[PDB]
Amino acid sequence: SLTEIEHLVQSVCKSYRETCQLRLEDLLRQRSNIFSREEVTGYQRKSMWEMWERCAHHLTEAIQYVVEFAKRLSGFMELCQNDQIVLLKAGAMEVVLVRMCRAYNADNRTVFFEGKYGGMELFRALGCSELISSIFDFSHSLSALHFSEDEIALYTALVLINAHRPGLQEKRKVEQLQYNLELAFHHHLCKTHRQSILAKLPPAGKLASLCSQHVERLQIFQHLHPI
């Protein structure tokens, strides 16, 4: 019934707001607080390992917030632990990527980082200009679409709950959860006249895989670098 779907929309959006890491209003407020050339040079002077270690810590914290989000979705804690881990492993980094658009300012093409906004040059020490440029382009595309907070909530909830992920054991429970979330999101998009917004989303699987790969690389080779 319509009331149940409205309540599911409310609950998903509430959980997302609870686990969104940074409130969108604070991001918009800090938009005016931009790194000075001295601070950008400071970040560019860091070693590749120092900068990658910081970025990987941030990505890990974001993955933890996405796990917290999943845990607050009705029915996800009913799935067996194996299915929970399969779903999180397969979708959490994509959800991090989606979330990152909230901290992107298309006007000046800067992103929030460690308290202030800075352009792409902040990451000169990462030596992965291709991946950095690609993730900035992805965030730019999502910002251009004016993806709202409720839309991010519902789309990420559906990114996580996917019954087609290889490894699932209880495919029917996951199917039912995904179907209820699809109903909720469809009703929301109809209310807002945003039905076609999903055909315009760009791909994100490759970027998320590369980010997870860098995180794993840093975990692995930590004995050959400083504490």
Partner: peptide
């Protein structure tokens, strides 16, 4: 999508 992410997830899940 790999073992390190799975470690993070297993830690944060329990």
């Amino acid at each position: 999508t790999n073992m390190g992410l799975e470690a993070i997830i297993r830690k944060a899940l329990m």
